[PDB]
Amino acid sequence: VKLAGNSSLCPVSGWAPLSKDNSVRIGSKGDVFVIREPFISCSPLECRTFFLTQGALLNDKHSDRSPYRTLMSVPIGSVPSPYNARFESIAWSASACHDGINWLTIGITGPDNGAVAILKYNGIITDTIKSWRNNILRTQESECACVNGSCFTVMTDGPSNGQASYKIFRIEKGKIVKSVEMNAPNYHYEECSCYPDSSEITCVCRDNWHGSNRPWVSFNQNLEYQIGYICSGIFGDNPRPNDKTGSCGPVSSNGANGVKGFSFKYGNGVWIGRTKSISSRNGFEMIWDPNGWTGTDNNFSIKQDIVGINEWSGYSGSFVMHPELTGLDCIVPCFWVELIRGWTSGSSISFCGVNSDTVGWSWPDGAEL
Amino acid sequence: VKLAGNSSLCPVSGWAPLSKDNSVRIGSKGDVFVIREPFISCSPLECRTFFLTQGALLNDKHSDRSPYRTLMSVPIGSVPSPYNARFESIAWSASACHDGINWLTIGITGPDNGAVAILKYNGIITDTIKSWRNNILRTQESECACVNGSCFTVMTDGPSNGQASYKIFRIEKGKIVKSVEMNAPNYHYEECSCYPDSSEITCVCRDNWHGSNRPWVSFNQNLEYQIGYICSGIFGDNPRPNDKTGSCGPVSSNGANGVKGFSFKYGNGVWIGRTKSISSRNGFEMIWDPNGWTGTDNNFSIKQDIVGINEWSGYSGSFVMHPELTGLDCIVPCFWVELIRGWTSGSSISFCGVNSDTVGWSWPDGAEL
Amino acid sequence: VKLAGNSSLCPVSGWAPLSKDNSVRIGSKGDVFVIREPFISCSPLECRTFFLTQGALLNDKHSDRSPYRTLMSVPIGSVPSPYNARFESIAWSASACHDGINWLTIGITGPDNGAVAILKYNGIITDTIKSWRNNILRTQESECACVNGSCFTVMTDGPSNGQASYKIFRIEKGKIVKSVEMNAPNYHYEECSCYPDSSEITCVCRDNWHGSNRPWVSFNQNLEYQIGYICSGIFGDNPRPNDKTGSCGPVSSNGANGVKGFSFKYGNGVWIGRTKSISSRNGFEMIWDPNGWTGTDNNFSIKQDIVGINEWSGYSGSFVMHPELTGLDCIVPCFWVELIRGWTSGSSISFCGVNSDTVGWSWPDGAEL
Amino acid sequence: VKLAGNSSLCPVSGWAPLSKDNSVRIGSKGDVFVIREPFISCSPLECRTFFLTQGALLNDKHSDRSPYRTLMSVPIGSVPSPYNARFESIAWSASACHDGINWLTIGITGPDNGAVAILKYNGIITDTIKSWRNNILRTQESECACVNGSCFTVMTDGPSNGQASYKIFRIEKGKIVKSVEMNAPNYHYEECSCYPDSSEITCVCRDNWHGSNRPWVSFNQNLEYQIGYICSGIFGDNPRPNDKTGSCGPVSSNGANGVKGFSFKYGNGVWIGRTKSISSRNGFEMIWDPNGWTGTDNNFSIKQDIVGINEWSGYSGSFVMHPELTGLDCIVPCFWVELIRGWTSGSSISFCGVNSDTVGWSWPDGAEL
Ligand SMILES: CCCC(=O)N[C@@H]1C(C(=O)O)=C[C@H](N)[C@@H](NC(C)=O)[C@@H]1OC(CC)CC
Ligand SMILES: CCCC(=O)N[C@@H]1C(C(=O)O)=C[C@H](N)[C@@H](NC(C)=O)[C@@H]1OC(CC)CC
Ligand SMILES: CCCC(=O)N[C@@H]1C(C(=O)O)=C[C@H](N)[C@@H](NC(C)=O)[C@@H]1OC(CC)CC
Ligand SMILES: CCCC(=O)N[C@@H]1C(C(=O)O)=C[C@H](N)[C@@H](NC(C)=O)[C@@H]1OC(CC)CC
Ligand SMILES: *[C@@H]1O[C@H](CO)[C@@H](O)[C@H](O)[C@H]1NC(C)=O
Ligand SMILES: *[C@@H]1O[C@H](CO)[C@@H](O)[C@H](O)[C@H]1NC(C)=O
Ligand SMILES: *[C@@H]1O[C@H](CO)[C@@H](O)[C@H](O)[C@H]1NC(C)=O
Ligand SMILES: *[C@@H]1O[C@H](CO)[C@@H](O)[C@H](O)[C@H]1NC(C)=O
Ligand SMILES: [Ca+2]
Ligand SMILES: [Ca+2]
Ligand SMILES: [Ca+2]
Ligand SMILES: [Ca+2]
């Protein structure tokens, strides 16, 4: 049965640990892929860790946008190895989601001025879209959001240090049925983390151009969209300045570059995931701002430690567990964090939102390099 | 269908070998996890060996309560390897059971003063409970017991060398529905081995404080409990003194520290599993005491050798095979023994109760260190 | 349900990347088979990469027609390894296809003057045919074509540098029910790539004797056949001369030897897959000739790059995805290319025909030797 | 559905290659078990290679009747590895068969004077029988034979160089329901190869005491048995004298010791599998004797080469494919051969009887030692 996606996020007060792969630690001896940009997507039966591999192993002489990059998946928490990983697509930029019937995999490959997104439904090539600006077509590097048998994704074409072009897609059974170009002057959208919420999609993305706060785009199934930035003074990007009075135009201070991230909107409140360090990808924390989606103050209520500030963090993205998998009355919000080591590989940890009792700690990669 | 758990243990006269993993012997060359605290739990379809990994392999650089510890499972008798193990939870103390529909996994992680038990039903986080004494929340390190779609576990919070706090839990579909704190002054319960018996749960645990005999707690589905110590003069813990007149309270002689163990109650009789050595974790034996549950004499009837006294034993725990898996009219009692080697890893052997003819022997780890 | 095979190939304008295994790159460290002559065949559920192994691993001291050669299969895109490969048959020449119910595997083994093809249906030996010319009985080294519960293959017996004997087979449930010897004087058929098309089978093969263009044979379910060569001046074999005015008699210029290849017939048009180099197995390209099946000119319309001319290509063959797997109204044409390295092993890439936007690129093996 | 086992062996004229694992060749680099006494048994869905492991890998320092020996299974033709093998039982002597519903596994372990056979049905311990002569209880080391939901096996207790005791067992759902001790003075039965034939079981075994011809026992479902020796002058054991006039009793010339073997009875005819060398386990051949079961001449009709006389053979045993798996009207006879190398390990090849065209060849182990 197709996932309805019409329930809301039930509110959470903390984040409980879900999975830890320990990829690099086992890969010191075992045959483990060198992976980057991992993400997690859940079927109605199981959750899977998707990853991009260079076709190389840890402690091997073969270890950015190469032809050898492929998208592969393993069950969540298992090591990415050649002996247990399922092939998905050829991709140096990817997204994957399950609409309740079959997996949808989007894989981008080709040259930087001629990249094509390859859409695969149940492992079958169903649609393609070529680059329309001819400057590195790229996508979420996290799970797409599916509502009522239709899955949605955001792709960016253009420069990564100036104004680019951003498109929203509606995908049904692997076929693109509607596309809308976002009219967003002076905005920058990269590597969006999208989730379904009450038959609508909310995406929180990365401003690589001039934004230390995170831009967002929210749209319905007809791709009627609204855009903006998260107005919290708790800035979500990395690099970023210190917490001051925020703004939701793009905040230019330390706004150049960034990191893939996520946020969960709860009315006017927001759950913010960000690095602990303001200049590097070190540490991670979950911050609840009761008015952060629209208010410009730097006041928050709940802070949960995820990764300690002396340990390497990296990309982070959102994923959801639908009621068809949980049996609950809501959509449970969850997130993964990539712990980059270095070759250059990463391990992943995942957390899920609960209203029950939690604790902050540090779950780092912990491999002696 | 949910496991009824209303039949009794049918009586057994011996123990037949069920599984042997040979983890360390294969891991001298193959890619095998360094595991500790293994245990076995059975679904209506298959039995699985659960284990805690440090995220490291045998003969590796990376090889107690660390953030990298995870609970993983393999089919029974297979080697714990990164290429065949299913991830279960992040845990340095764990319990797992199957209610007949889905696996329930309990995983404890976090700091020693802030540990939280994470309950997972069908891989979905369903409930959590924080440490309530803030001194190392810990659980069975063996399978929980399930009766009529509800699974039961015992957790300990407090010191491991004095009086602590002990709680019983009723868990339905991964949700805690009832908790009772055990009023047990001058008792110590650690690492309980629980089994279902005639719609009731019987747990035999480890007295780390001042007991060389094993304490027990038995409760119904409403958590109405009775407590006591195994009165047999055949003392079940390690370390222990020589077999003398036992007591129905804690026997203080060599009562400090201990080892995880099990016992099967048969009316006033008891099947006792214990180490052969009275001072170290060497050897194992199964002893049938026809009046050992309530009588203080050191007389027994049947002794079966399991592990020879020159070979390394360790933790031991009980597990059961329900009529839904066996097709029988009773609940078959079974047990595993961990053979600790050393890194520090262990291999596991498992035995099941039969009424047919058996033999005592030695099935040790057999690796060359 | 048996595959109908009565729909036609829907026309395609480009080829989208489907799979990439990166076998040699992972095999620099991991346990990966040394494979040759790979091919891909699809079930109604999944596509599988079939391959022949010498029973040896990459970077191993054990690494043409040997008794140790076996046919093995993995899911498409996964590495050929001893820990994930399914055994199929003992074969130094093989073909495999799925009729919609079960896999049919044809495996040829034995001495060069006494070889026998072993037919296996659902892993069960169902029929055999011995060599009738006693000079290396051999078969497609690609997927057989199945129409209406009956699968078809072409086998060659005789010399590889002169006139040989060629037979067509009808195989139902692994049993040969009809055979016809092709009356083809001055023709040479080796390693045919066969596909179903409107309840008919079209095979494009390799002329090792005196042909730089590719011969073809097309037959119905009663094995009533027509034969000929591809009249295009775009010659499809390797080695070959430069593109000039071609013919569909055998073109003798550089006609000696050859390489396994494929072509897709579209009325009087043809999609031609060939190496970029005219003297060696380097590079690959997809060429659309609107009148190439019957016209002798060297004019074409669409050229798509697949493998760059500085990179190693090799065998190439056709495979199809039936409507029972895609849900479409047509049979989607697809193809694989073997990238030979060196031991002597190869990695595989696969492409499928789409009517949407594509791009040419180079997806080479990429292992540093 | 339970296998009927009431059809006869349909006659065959040759043997076609079924599987080849190449375990030692891959195990020169990969993680492959050191195995001995392999055999093959088929479910209604698939055939599996069963094997005994010392708990050690090829090229490892850990590499007869040890406690570490276990019975393990893989799909047929796949390498015996720790990452793909299913655990079956703890055994240094074993038998396994599928009655059409579940696997039955018989595993013998314990000391030489106290060994017990452990019967496992669907992985559940269902019955045990201890040694009754206290001199190495042992069993077929090949598949048991199942007729009408009941499986049959032959076990030997006593000396391997004199008169011993032999018992027939009827096993239904893993439970022994009838046992008969064979009254066979001056006979020796070791390592029987049993097959079903027209609701009856025929076993051909090894005379280790004083027989260079193979003894046989045939019984119905009520264990009413007849005994004798294969009267053919083509002697089936190894060591053996040259082919001369045979006898219906044990032939004392080179009768001491022997090797596990098989024969298929066809009325008064017999298909005989034996080594090519008369003094060592080198080579293998399939010999059809039209009157060999009762006639004492050394004349035969069909000889098929299996393993060349310069290559290492070893144990050989029979297995069958029932009509529930093949869909045929008869029971197809099949056999495996163990190719012993050396550590001391072996690979396996398997053949099945067909009435179509075959060829003799040599499929040896092929590893460089
Ligand atoms: C470090 C400076 C450059 C930078 O940001 N690189 C980004 C990145 C990272 O680790 O940050 C990792 C990804 N491999 C990049 N994705 C692609 C398609 O290449 C990504 O780049 C995107 C998104 C901003 C634009 C092309
Ligand atoms: C000899 C070291 C002290 C000691 O007894 N350690 C125990 C132990 C062992 O192998 O004995 C193994 C476990 N890893 C311990 N469990 C935890 C949560 O740490 C356990 O400790 C528990 C139960 C007594 C109390 C915290
Ligand atoms: C360059 C060596 C001669 C040659 O052409 N070899 C061919 C080949 C190649 O890679 O070209 C690979 C295959 N292993 C060969 N197949 C067999 C059954 O041996 C094949 O040979 C066939 C088809 C022409 C005739 C026997
Ligand atoms: C040459 C050594 C003596 C000998 O014959 N060994 C036999 C053997 C072999 O490879 O021949 C292999 C098996 N491992 C033996 N089985 C057991 C239970 O030990 C078997 O022995 C059996 C059957 C005769 C009697 C105990
Ligand atoms: C969502 O849609 C389903 C059917 O797809 C319906 O049964 C359900 O009531 C809806 N849920 C909400 C919260 O509106
Ligand atoms: C246990 O309960 C089941 C239903 O769950 C019932 O059919 C059965 O009779 C009960 N068994 C006993 C021994 O009371
Ligand atoms: C092919 O045959 C199927 C039944 O096997 C039929 O339903 C279908 O219409 C046919 N398709 C075409 C294109 O003729
Ligand atoms: C064997 O028994 C089955 C039922 O189990 C019956 O249908 C069949 O006819 C029998 N076969 C023979 C050859 O007697
Ligand atoms: Ca930024
Ligand atoms: Ca104690
Ligand atoms: Ca040619
Ligand atoms: Ca003999």
Automatic annotation (TrEMBL), chains A, B, C, D:
Cell compartment(s), UniProt: Host membrane; Virion membrane; Host apical cell membrane
Coverage span on the entire protein: 83 to 463 of 469
Catalytic activity entry: Hydrolysis of alpha-(2->3)-, alpha-(2->6)-, alpha-(2->8)- glycosidic linkages of terminal sialic acid residues in oligosaccharides, glycoproteins, glycolipids, colominic acid and synthetic substrates
Record: residues binding substrate: 36, 65, 190-191, 206, 281
Active site as annotated: 64, 315
Gene: NA
Chain positions covered by the region annotation Head of neuraminidase: 9-369
Keywords for this protein: Calcium, Disulfide bond, Glycoprotein, Glycosidase, Host cell membrane, Host membrane, Hydrolase, Membrane, Metal-binding, Signal-anchor, Transmembrane, Transmembrane helix, Virion
Entry's family note: Belongs to the glycosyl hydrolase 34 family.
Cofactor: Ca(2+)
Main localization (coarse): host cell
Residues noted as binding Ca(2+) 3 in the record, renumbered to the chain: 289, 291, 297, 299
Keyword Repressor recorded: no
Physiological role: Catalyzes the removal of terminal sialic acid residues from viral and cellular glycoconjugates. Cleaves off the terminal sialic acids on the glycosylated HA during virus budding to facilitate virus release. Additionally helps virus spread through the circulation by further removing sialic acids from the cell surface. These cleavages prevent self-aggregation and ensure the efficient spread of the progeny virus from cell to cell. Otherwise, infection would be limited to one round of replication.
Domain characteristics, as noted in the entry: Intact N-terminus is essential for virion morphogenesis. Possess two apical sorting signals, one in the ectodomain, which is likely to be a glycan, and the other in the transmembrane domain. The transmembrane domain also plays a role in lipid raft association.
Organism per entry: Influenza A virus
Post-translation changes: N-glycosylated.
UniProt-annotated binding residues for Ca(2+) 1: 31
A GO molecular function held by the record: metal ion binding
Record text on activity regulation: Inhibited by the neuraminidase inhibitors zanamivir (Relenza) and oseltamivir (Tamiflu). These drugs interfere with the release of progeny virus from infected cells and are effective against all influenza strains. Resistance to neuraminidase inhibitors is quite rare.
GO cellular component, as recorded: host cell plasma membrane; membrane; virion membrane
Root EC class: hydrolase
Disulfide bonds: 10-330, 42-47, 97-144, 146-151, 192-205, 194-203, 231-248, 334-352
Protein's recorded name: Neuraminidase
Residues annotated as binding Ca(2+) 2: 207, 211, 237, 255, 257
Residues bound to Ca(2+): 207, 211, 237, 257
A biological-process GO annotation: viral budding from plasma membrane
